[PDB]
Each structure stands twice: as C-alpha cells, then as structure tokens.
Design a protein around this ligand. Structure first.
Ligand code: RV6
Lengths: 248, 327, 826
C-alpha cells in the first residue's frame, strides 16, 4: 500500500554517500546546507512554510537512495522545491527558482547547475518522483504543534511563548535527519517538551488531565521519554555546534 | 514492494486500445499479463517539459493515494515506459497512471436511447455518488469538475467518481483565491457563474443535483453555450438571484453586471412535478441558489430518498443487451 | 471537413396513420393517408380513391386529426411532428391551383419532461374546444382552440397518474372529459377527469375507476346514444359508462394481439378490430331500448370477418370499402360483403398498394447483365414477408416474391445462379410437445429440405420449460433461384438457433463457393447469448451440404469476407479466421475493445466496426504481424443501426435516433492522439431508420453514360421503405449547393411553417446540433418545381469561388440544367 519512510539512526552509517567515502560530518554538513538552501530560496520567493518543509523532506529522503558525490546537492534542492511547489499548490516557475538560486549562491556553488541550470533541474524531476516513490503527500510537525497547542488552556502569553519557541525548533530540525527518524507527530511533541523544559513550564497543568504528568500521551500514544530525549538532544546539538544559542 | 511506484514497465500491460482522451493524456484500456486484470492507463507525458510533470496528474496522484472509498476510483500503481539507461538526462519517456477499468460512462449510457433508470435504480446511483462525495468532503477535498462523463459505472451497478485533475483542498478558516472557471458550464453552480473566487464544497452538490434531475429526464437540465444564458436557464427554474433568497449575492463580483431577463419565481417543483416526492425535496435542496443554504453531502444521505437505501440489495442498471441488438 | 449529398430514390411507402373526413370540401369524403414525412390526400369514389394532392412536411408526422370547429364550413387538419412542431392546416383550391394553408403553428416542446413509453398521443374534443396532448409522463398539455391562438400557446395540467397507456375525449359529457387507462403497481385502471379551460386544471370525472385487464391497450370513445368507452385488451373487451360494466371475452381474440380500431356506424353500433396475424373482426354493440325511450348497451359481440394485411391503421369508407394501412405489409382496399364466400370469408381484396415495408437487408445485383443493377430487398414481416426486385425504368419497376415468413438477411451467389436468404417463421407450442406453424411459408414449401443435426450444444443439461401457446422463432436458410425465385431448398437451424449473419464467398485456396451463416443460441433466460455456430454450407446439385462448423461462445452478429479470410463479430470479440486445407476454420487473431460488435465493413486491410453504444471504430489488419491494430475510434457516443465505408478516410453511420453522421481520420498527424480521433465532420437528420447500407446504383449504366459531379454510390434502406443514396461532393460543388439551399429555404413555403434548418438538425433527446457536411437533395431537386419568379429570385447574387471555375454569375436556366444532371443519379 504505502511506503515506509523512517530509518534507525544506526542505518545512516550506510547511506550511499557514506559508502562512497563521505564521512558522517560531511554528509551532515551537506544536508544542512542543502536544506538551508531550500529554506532560503523559497523564503525569498515568498513560499508557505509547508512548501519549504516538503521540499526539504523530499531532499532528505532523496539522499537515502543516492550519493552526494553523484548528485550535486543544490540542483537536487532546487528540484525538490520546484516539485514541492506543485504538490502544495504554491507553484513557481523553474526559471524563477534558478534566478533566486543564482542570487544566493556564489560562482563556485552555482557551478553545480552546469551550463544550463534550468534543464539540469528539470531533468532531475523524473528521478525525484521515482525516488520518493510518487508518495507526494507529507505531514509536518507544524500542524501538530498547533493542533496540540489548541487543546492547552491557561496563560495566553506563556503558551504563545511555548509555541513560538517550539516552532523555531521545528524550523531548525529540518536541517537534520530527524525528519527521517520520527513521524512528525512525535517531532511536534518533542519540541513542546523541549520548549517546556527550557521555559520552566509544566505543560500537564494546561491539559484536560492536569495530574497526568506524561502530558503528551493524550496526543501521541506509545512515545517513551527516551525517544523524546533523543530528539531534544539532537536539536540542541545544532545550537552548541554553531554559534547560535537557544531562542528563549 | 507494492509501494515502490514509478519503476515497473508498461510492458507488463498489453494495450487493448484507446478508450478516451484525457485532459493531460489519452487513456488506454489494458490487461496485466500477470494477473489478467483489466486496467486503464492514463498517459502522463513530461516530454513537453514546459513546466515539468503536469499538475493535473500531480493532484490526481496526491489525492487518490489518500482517498479510499468504494465510490472513488482507485489508482493501482504508476508504471514507466521502457526508459533510457545510464542517461538520466536523456530520458524523455512517459509515465502511466493505472486505474481500474470501468465498462461505461454515465453520459454514454444515457446517450444510448434506452438505458432506463427506475426510482430504485436512481436511489442506488445517487447514494453511492453522495457517499463518495461525503467521503471526499469529510477529507476537505473538492472534486470541482462533476459531470456525466466523470461518473463511471460498472455492470455490477458500482458507481465511482473518477477525474480528480481539478481537485484542491478547502480550508473553512482560511480563504484563498481560487481558479474562476472550475466546472463544466452545463453542470456549473450559480455562484461560479457570478464569479465566486472562494468556492465552497456546495459547488459539487449543485452539480450532483443537475445529475439527479438528469436521471429522471434523460436530458441535462441546464444546457447553454454561454455563461449568461446558463444563468438565465437556472433562473427560469430556480428563480433569479435576489438578495431576499441569497443575502450575499451582492458581494459577488458579477451580480450587478449579469442580470436575468426577469426576476423569475422558482418553479422547480412545478416543472419537476413528475418526480417522486421524496426525490423532489432532494432536488429542491441541492438546487438551492445560496451555497450556504444548499444542503451538504451528509444531509443528502440523511434524506427520505436515500436514508433507507441498502447498497447490499444493489439493483443492476437496465441490461438491454440482447433485445437492442435485434430490435 | 467532408462534403456529401443525400437524395431520396423511393419515398416512404409504409402507412403510419389514416383518417377520413371532409378536408378538401365540406361535400367530398376524403381519406388522408400519412407516411413518414409525407401526407397523401384522396377523395373517396365508388370505384376506389382519387388522388388530389400530396405534400411533404419537414418532420415525421406523429399526430394527424381532422376536426371542424363551429364557424368553419369544412374540416381542418392538425398535424404534430415528432420534434413537437404543431400546426393547423387548411385545404384551399383556386380552380387548378391547389395549396395548403398554415392557419396556426408553433413548437410545443417543454424544457423539462420525461417522454412517455406509449409515445405521443393526440386527441381533440368532440366540441373542438381544445386539443389534448400526452407528451411527457405526469403531464397533460392543453392547446385551447380559440380563434386568437394562432401560435398554439398551451399549458400543462399536473397528472398524478404517471404511466398512461391511452386516452380519448369522451362523447356525451357536460364538460370536456378525458377517459384513459393507466398503470401503477396494483395493475391497470380506467379513470376519468374533466378539463377546465377557465381553471386550467382537472376536476373530478363523471365515472369511477374500474381496474381493468392487465394488458388493456386501447381506449374507444363511443358516441351517443351509448356514450362511455370501450377498453380493448388481449383477452377481453369491456365497456364502461358510469354504472354500466360489460365484459365479453371470446376465445378467438386471445390468439393474436389486436392493434387497431375504427368506427363503422357513426352511432357507435359497429366497430372494426384488427390483430397482428391479420384477422379483421367486427365489434357489434347490441342495443336495447327501454320503455322510457333510453337506449342501453345489451351486450358486446365479436364476429370474425376475414383476413387483411397486418394493419397499423384502419379506416372505413362509407361505401363499405375499408382501407388497410400497413407498416409491415402492403396496404389494401378490401370489401366487406354481407354474404360470406364459399370459404367462409366476408372480406375480398380490391386493390393492393405496394409497400416496401421493413427493409431488413438488401443486396445490389445485376441479374440480366444489363449493367443497370437491381435491388433485391428483404421486405415485410411475418405473413407479409417478401423479397422485392427493384429496377429503374419515369418510375421504379418492382416485382414481389411472397414468403409468408420473416426475411432477415440476403446475399447473392452468382456461381449457383441463386440467392441465399435467412428467414424466420412463428410456430406455437402445441399439445404434442412440439410446435405447429400458423400457416405454410417459404421454409416449408421448399422443393428439397434439410435440418441441422449438429451435436455441438447437444450436451445441454440446461432446462427450458415450454407452455402450450407460447411463440417460438424457427430460423431457416432459403436457397432461391435468381430467375424464377422458386424456393429450391430450405435448411432449418437448431431449436432456439437464431440465424443472424450470412455471406457467400470463396476462402483460402478452396475453389468451392460456400454459403456461410452465423448463428446464436438464444434462450429466454440469457440476457446476452453465450453460444453460437459458424456453419459452412455448400449448395450443389439442388442440395445444401454442411461442410464445416465452428463453435463460438457468443452471437455471430455480422461476418464479412476479408481477403480470403473470414471476419466475425462474436459479442465483444472481433475475429479473423483462416480456411485451412482441411476445410476447417482456424482463428488467426482477435480484438476485444468493443461492448458489442454489431456491424462490420471492410476495404482493403481496413475494417470498420459499429458498436451498440461506442459508435464507429476503424481497425486495420497488419499482415506482417498477423493481428489487428486500432487505428481510430469515434469518441462521441452514438447508438448504431448501420455503417458503411465511403472511402479510405470517410466513414458513414446511422443512429437509432433517425440521424446520419460521417467520421473521418483527422489527417493532422502531429500526435498519435489526433490520428486516433475520428472527427464527426457530417451531421444530418435523415428522418428514417437505416437498417442497411449497400454500395451500388440502379441507374442504367452504359458505355459513355451521363456523368455527374457527385462521386460514389451508397444506397440505404429504411424501416418505412424509403430507399436513398449518399454520395460525395467536391468542396466547390458543396458550397454552391449549400449556398443555394439557404436561398431556397427563404423562397420555398413550408407546410406548417417548419424551418428546414431545424428539421435536418441532428436530434437526440439529449442533443440538437445544426446539420453539417450534407446537402438535402430533395430541397435541391425542388428547385425544378418552384415557379419561374421564385427561380430567378433564388439565383440573384450567385457567385463562383476559388477560381479554376466558371463565370461567377449564374442564371435560372443554367441552374435548371445543373439540378437535372443531379437527378440522373437517382
Ligand atoms: C475520467 C473519465 C474519462 C471519460 O472519458 N475517462 C475514462 N473513461 C472511462 N470509461 C470508458 C469509456 C469508453 C469505453 C469503451 C470504448 C470502446 C469500447 C468499449 N468501451 C470504456 C470505458 C474509464 N474507465 C475507467 N477509467 C479510468 C482511467 C478512471 C476511465 N476513464
């Protein structure tokens, strides 16, 4: 019926990229740069947050089946965003994506697009569709962050701070392979869990079950803290590695 | 696995012939050598490459892998032309969308002189169609082009909605500008003939009502060539759009510009007096001018006409297969 | 685009209705006989009928009624066409000049309505206050006959009873009253209503709703003194007049369904009844007058008079001559004698009016080597079945060959100097367990005879019960001599075997010429037949030899010879067989994308397929591969009655809606999508049902024969007998002739003021399209019959186009020659 789109962390040691001699740090760097490229290009074009995420998910899934050494990442990214626009009904012309990609990329980077940027991107669409197995519908942590937040009742200002902080954590997780490890529902909970710990909020008080200390179980069944802890740990790693700090 | 679409070859199917021409590509009937199942392949060509894979097909793939209902046609898989190898850039082959094959289309059956539909035949027909629309509508998807060509019939009596190439998600909280021309003129709703930019799920209900009346007359109700003439025909039957029956008609862009010959009074019950009473109320409710006062798909199922129809006791449509051959 | 020309060689001959009245003068007795689109006016003489006038109407004549409103000297005529064109007509004669006046006219079609099962019914009030029309289920339409209603404006009264069988206005009522039989789930009932023009609704009727025979079919309004109505069924005749109820159920009428009724004595004492086996009865109303002076109906009585042709309409001439109008057979004038003849019959035929009747199939063959060609038609049905030999010589010369059983298909086998004809006759389950024929016929009067002994389906184990009195069809292959038309041989097919297709040809390397018949095993239980045979016969030395048989799992509706191979249509499958050196059929290849392959035609390696609902499909045989290939299909859905191939790119079809269309290859081969789309380039409402298309012409072709601009000769036959020719035209000749049509239509006065453009428009219940690609030959050939002033008016401003042609200006005398050259083809 439907394909399985989730791997174990241990499995990422065996992507095509890894097996062609790319080390873990480099593939992680490539994923961040490609994702952020998709994010930045689409933001300049005015694209909805779901359209940006859909392109990023296509991108992340793509490099579970192909190597970064044989498919230049920024071409792939542009192709993903191009298709994502058509899937999420926020379409853009390929020539406008190229235009923006050129504005943001230096001369070396735009070298990936070769002599004819548009064709290199348009050609890849065939591979992209086959690779993602024509499973175009994608759900994202955003919708669950809001669906779950709507069921919280309490201080209007403390909950809005939780949501925005969690929302930022969602945007940051698109640069990681979490999209490939955990369903979006879990991601939405994990970012709520993290924003809560950092803001010293006790979310259970805002739920319909205020004495149910594992507040998330009423939103997402069967999620152990260990799963939530791993996701939280991975998100904060990006901040510690970079110069950026937690939003608070 | 069964889920790894886009890889299998079109070779596995033998092309019986071209059954119809689809908006994005022609449709062919075919047989799976392995299973013997009869399937219909819709040809999708990216070879034009004007803007890549067609969005009409993208909608139909995106939506029909999500929608599972007996009254919704199932895409079985997607196959590819024997493609060029090692030359991913040089590949200009086509993709085919596999569907279940349906023997007939509603328009073709009605166009044949004597496909006679009894009251109980229409009950089984409309119940399935509206259940499917209810399913799609509960999933917040709007099948905008509802016509007699799109309703497909199997000799079993199973009815299935088919061409989702013009379907988009509708949010009730967040209105978005939408394409102005979304339905075929004969089955188009009045708000879209007056230029409604934010279409409702009720636009589909209006179409299904046009069909409801058509099944009792064997002739489309509103046949016109131009948008104004269509508004006149609708007005002759349903009444002219007026603020008293449609308070927000004034907000529609073309209301002042587009006027019927007269401010007609509704005659729907008079011109359709031959229709059973249980059905006439259904027609009256579906053909309501104000989309906010027009019944929903669920409400049609909770009607005296369709409430108690049991699909288990399916009534086959008229089978004139042998007397018609040798009159 | 394509350009074609349609001309009528023989006018419709079947009688669709007949009335007698005082239409031409208040003094004369007139018989108005209506054939499809044609009205004939006669005057009754002591010898027969004197013809006086014939007009064509741009419509199929559906309702024809004579009435005389107060203030008129003579009867007026109402005619309603099947496209709902209504009009009131008057006969006016100025010495030698006879013309028809359109007094009122209009189209009474409703935007919304369900056409009724029992068809359009039209009746007129005895006081001629209104015309009643039953057009749609649940609605009664009233045209009030006031002096001011020149447009025939009308209103609808809601009718609760949705399924109406028949209705008549009643005599002897205080208000206009309708009496009708209707059907609901509880059976059939007879009910009455009163009709109020002031209130524009029904009021309670004069008498009660008796429930009547389940198959009650016809309503008779009986005049004073009796009043009330008579109801005719399958087993009983009942008379209802308020409290009165009478029922006669004589066993004689149960035998054959009665279909027509006519009043003999204006006072209602005597009526005529006719049934499908051709019997003519007298229905007598026995009178009893009570002391108070009142006349009561004592009893109903039925007396058998004799036999006529199966009558569609009956009408009595006061001289005691009864006109028998038949759609299925020859029409007649018969005499009712007071004394029976020595055989017991009171009916003696006077005159016989030739009716080509149902033309089920036809073949064009040159029997005498004159080169002219003759048309041999399968004509008539049941006891009226016949073959007709038709040749030009200015009228058509027609020889009639009675068969007394139904002919279905005909093919000519020259090698044997004979025809092969498929026929069926009706036998009835009798007390022996077998069946008995109602009369001897061609298949029983053959010189030599044979019966299939095939064991193919003999395993049976499928039960089919028989009840005494039920009808069955018995199918035969007749071998008929081409000079004498003697039935040389008759071969009877298996029980429940229907013969559907016949060909005469040689196959493969086999020098023998064979008769090949395709059959289907038809059982009442099966909705679609699931068994069939292809049988190869040889006619040799006065005997028919069964050469080979091939079992198929379906009905072989149509077969055609294909380059030494045999093409077959078995239900959905289209198959090509090869004839082996072992004299058995062997399958080469198949095609399955058809709902039902009813009609087949071939040219070269190309095959045209006609489907019940999938219109036309152009196939090709690919010899390099040994299989078929779909070249192109007409995607617009149409119901097919017959198909023909005009040329390699143009295909002609006939719809069951009385329409003709032409499909061409798109010849814009930029995309495979376009090649495959046959595009309907021609649309024309013929007004007739085309059963058979046949290439050939009856014109006396000779070395150096007058040539015409029209190219090709496709002849067609219809159910009402019309024979017509379809031919191709160059773009220049079409444009000339079409531009002339538009000019002629402005000049020529139509009966009922019916627009010609409307009449020829493509018309189904769902669609109406303007005609395209077709020239109405009859309109073109009517140029020669319009007066000189009108001719010159037509040719004003006539110009030639596209160069490479003549001087643009055209005169009336030039055109008179062109049309006459065009009349050579027919
Ligand atoms: C999206 C509607 C559009 C309508 O034209 N296409 C379409 N029409 C179908 N009906 C059809 C038409 C003709 C024939 C035919 C022709 C010749 C001989 C015998 N049969 C059979 C079936 C159909 N059946 C399954 N599908 C799937 C692709 C959804 C279909 N799609």
């Amino acid at each position: 019926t439907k394909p399985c789109w989730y791997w174990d962390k241990k499995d990422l040691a065996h992507t095509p990229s890894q097996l062609e001699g790319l080390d873990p740090a480099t593939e992680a760097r490539y994923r961040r740069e490609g994702a952020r490229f998709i994010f930045d290009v689409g933001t300049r074009l005015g694209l909805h947050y779901d359209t940006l995420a859909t392109g990023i998910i296509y991108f992340h899934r793509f490099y579970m089946f192909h190597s970064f050494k044989q498919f230049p990442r920024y071409v792939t990214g542009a192709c993903c965003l191009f298709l994502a626009g058509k899937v999420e009904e926020t379409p853009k012309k390929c020539k406008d994506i190229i235009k923006t990609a050129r504005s943001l990329l230096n001369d070396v980077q735009f070298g990936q697009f070769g002599d004819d940027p548009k064709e290199e991107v348009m050609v890849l669409e065939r591979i992209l569709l086959q690779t993602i197995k024509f499973d175009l519908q994608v759900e994202h942590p955003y919708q669950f962050l809001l669906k779950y937040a709507k069921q919280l009742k309490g201080d209007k200002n403390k909950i809005q701070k939780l949501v925005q902080m969690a929302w930022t954590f969602v945007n940051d997780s698109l640069c990681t392979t979490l999209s490939l490890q955990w369903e979006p529902e879990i991601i939405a909970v994990a970012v709520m869990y993290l924003a809560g710990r950092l803001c010293k909020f006790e979310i259970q008080e805002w739920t319909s079950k205020p004495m149910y200390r594992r507040w998330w179980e009423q939103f997402v069944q069967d999620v152990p803290v260990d799963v939530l802890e791993d996701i939280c740990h991975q998100i904060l790693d990006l901040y510690s590695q970079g110069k950026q700090q937690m939003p608070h | 696995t069964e889920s790894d679409w886009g890889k299998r070859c079109v070779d596995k199917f033998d092309i019986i012939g071209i059954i119809g021409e689809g908006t994005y590509g022609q449709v062919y009937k075919a047989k799976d050598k392995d299973t013997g199942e009869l399937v219909a392949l819709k040809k999708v060509r990216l070879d034009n490459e004007k803007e890549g894979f067609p969005i009409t097909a993208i909608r139909e793939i995106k939506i029909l892998r999500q929608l599972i209902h007996r009254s919704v046609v199932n895409m079985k898989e997607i196959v590819t032309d024997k493609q060029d190898a090692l030359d991913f850039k040089k590949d200009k082959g086509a993709f085919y969308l596999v569907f279940e094959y349906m023997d007939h289309d509603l328009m073709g059956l009605l166009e044949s002189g004597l496909v006679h539909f009894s009251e109980d035949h229409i009950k089984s027909f409309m119940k399935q169609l509206m259940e499917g629309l209810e399913y799609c509508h509960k999933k917040n998807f709007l099948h905008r082009d509802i016509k007699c060509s799109n309703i497909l019939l199997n000799n079993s009596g199973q009815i299935k909605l088919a061409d989702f190439g013009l379907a988009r998600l509708y949010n009730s909280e967040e209105s978005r500008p939408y394409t102005n021309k979304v339905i075929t003129l004969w089955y188009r709703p009045p708000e879209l003939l007056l230029g409604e930019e934010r279409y409702t799920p009720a636009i589909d209900v209006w179409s299904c009502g046009c069909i409801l009346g058509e099944l009792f007359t064997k002739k489309p109700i509103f046949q016109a060539n131009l948008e104004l003439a269509q508004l006149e025909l609708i007005s002759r039957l349903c009444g002219s759009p007026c603020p008293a029956v449609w308070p927000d008609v004034i907000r529609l862009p073309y209301f002042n510009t587009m006027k019927p010959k007269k401010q007609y009074r509704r005659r729907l019950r008079e011109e359709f007096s031959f229709i059973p009473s249980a059905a006439l109320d259904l027609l009256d409710h579906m053909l309501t001018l104000d989309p906010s006062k027009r019944c929903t798909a669920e409400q049609t199922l909770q009607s005296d006409f369709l409430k108690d129809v049991e699909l288990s006791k399916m009534a086959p449509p008229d089978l004139p297969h042998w007397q018609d051959c040798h009159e | 685009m394509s350009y074609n020309y349609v001309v009528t060689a023989q006018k419709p001959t079947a009688v669709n209705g007949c009335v007698t009245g005082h239409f031409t003068s208040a003094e004369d007795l007139n018989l108005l006989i209506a054939k499809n689109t044609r009205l004939e006016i006669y005057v009754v003489t002591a010898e027969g009928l004197r013809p006086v006038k014939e007009v064509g109407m741009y419509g199929k004549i559906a309702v024809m009624e004579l009435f005389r409103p107060k203030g008129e000297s003579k009867d007026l005529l109402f005619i309603l066409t099947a496209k709902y064109n209504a009009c009131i007509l008057e006969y006016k004669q100025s010495g030698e000049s006879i013309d028809i006046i359109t007094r009122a006219h209009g189209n009474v079609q409703d935007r919304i309505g369900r056409p009724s099962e029992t068809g359009i019914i039209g009746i007129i009030d005895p006081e001629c206050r209104m015309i009643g029309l039953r057009l749609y289920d649940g609605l009664f339409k009233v045209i009030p006959l006031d002096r001011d209603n020149k447009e025939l404006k009308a209103f609808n009264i809601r009718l609760e009873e949705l399924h109406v069988i028949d209705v008549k206005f009643l005599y002897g009522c205080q208000a206009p009253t309708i009496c009708f039989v209707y059907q609901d789930p509880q059976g059939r009932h007879v009910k009455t209503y009163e009709v109020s023009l002031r209130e524009k609704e029904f009021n309670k009727g004069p008498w009660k709703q008796e429930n009547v025979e389940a198959e009650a079919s016809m309503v008779i309004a009986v005049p004073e003194p009796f009043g009330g109505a008579i109801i005719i069924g399958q087993e009983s005749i009942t008379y209802h007049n308020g409290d009165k109820y009478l029922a006669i159920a004589p066993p004689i009428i149960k035998q054959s369904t009665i279909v027509c009724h006519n009043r003999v004595d204006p006072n209602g004492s005597r009526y005529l009844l006719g049934d499908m086996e051709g019997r003519l009865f007298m229905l007598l109303l026995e009178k009893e007058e009570q002391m108070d002076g009142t006349v009561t109906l004592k009893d109903l009585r039925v007396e058998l008079l004799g036999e006529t042709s199966i009558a569609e309409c009956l009408t009595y001439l006061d001289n005691g001559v009864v006109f028998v109008g038949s759609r299925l057979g020859d029409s007649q004038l018969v005499k009712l004698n007071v004394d029976s003849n020595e055989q017991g019959s009171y009916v003696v035929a006077m005159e016989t009016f030739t009716n080509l009747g149902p033309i089920v199939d036809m073949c064009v063959v040159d029997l005498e080597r004159q080169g002219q060609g003759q048309l041999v038609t399968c004509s008539g049905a049941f006891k009226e079945g016949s073959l007709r030999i038709i040749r030009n010589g200015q009228k058509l010369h027609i020889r009639t060959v009675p068969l007394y059983e139904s002919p279905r298909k005909i093919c000519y086998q020259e090698v044997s100097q004979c025809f092969g004809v498929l026929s069926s006759r009706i036998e009835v389950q009798d007390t022996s367990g077998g069946t008995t024929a109602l009369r001897p016929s061609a298949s029983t009067q053959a010189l030599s005879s044979s019966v299939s002994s095939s064991k193919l389906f003999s395993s049976s184990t499928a039960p089919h019960e028989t009840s005494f009195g039920e009808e069955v069809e018995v199918h035969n292959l007749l071998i008929i001599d081409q000079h004498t038309f003697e039935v040389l041989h008759a071969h009877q097919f298996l029980q429940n075997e229907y013969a559907l297709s016949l060909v005469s040809c040689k196959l493969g390397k086999d020098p023998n010429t064979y008769f090949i018949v395709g059959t289907a095993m038809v059982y009442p239980e099966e909705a679609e037949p699931k068994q069939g045979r292809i049988v190869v016969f040889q006619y040799s030395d006065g005997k028919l030899q069964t050469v080979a048989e091939k079992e198929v799992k379906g009905a072989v509706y149509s077969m055609v010879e294909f380059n030494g191979k045999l093409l077959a249509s078995i239900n959905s499958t289209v198959r090509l067989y090869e004839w082996t050196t072992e004299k058995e059929l062997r399958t080469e290849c198949n095609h399955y994308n058809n709902i039902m392959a009813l009609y087949l035609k071939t040219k070269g390696d190309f095959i045209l397929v006609g489907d019940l609902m999938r219109s036309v499909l152009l196939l090709a045989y690919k010899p390099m591969e040994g299989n078929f290939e779909e070249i192109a299909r007409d995607f617009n859905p149409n119901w097919m009655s017959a198909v023909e191939i005009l040329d390699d790119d143009n295909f002609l079809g006939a719809e069951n809606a009385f329409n003709l269309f032409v499909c061409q290859k798109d010849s814009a081969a930029t995309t495979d999508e376009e090649r495959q789309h046959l595009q309907e380039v021609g649309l024309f409402h013929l007004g007739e049902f085309v059963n058979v298309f046949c290439h050939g012409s009856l014109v006396m072709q000779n070395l150096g024969e007058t040539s015409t601009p029209t190219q090709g000769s496709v002849l067609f036959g219809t159910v009402n007998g019309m024979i017509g020719l379809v031919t191709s035209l160059s773009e220049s000749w079409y444009n000339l002739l079409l531009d002339m049509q538009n000019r002629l239509n402005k000049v020529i006065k139509s009966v009922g003021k019916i627009e010609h453009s409307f009449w020829r428009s493509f018309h189904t219940e769902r669609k109406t399209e303007p005609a395209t690609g077709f020239i109405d030959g009859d309109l073109i050939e009517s140029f020669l019959d319009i007066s000189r002033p009108k001719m010159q008016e037509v040719v004003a401003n006539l110009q030639y186009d596209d160069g490479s042609g003549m001087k643009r200006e055209a005169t009336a005398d030039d055109l008179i020659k062109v049309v006459e050259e065009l009349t050579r083809i027919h």
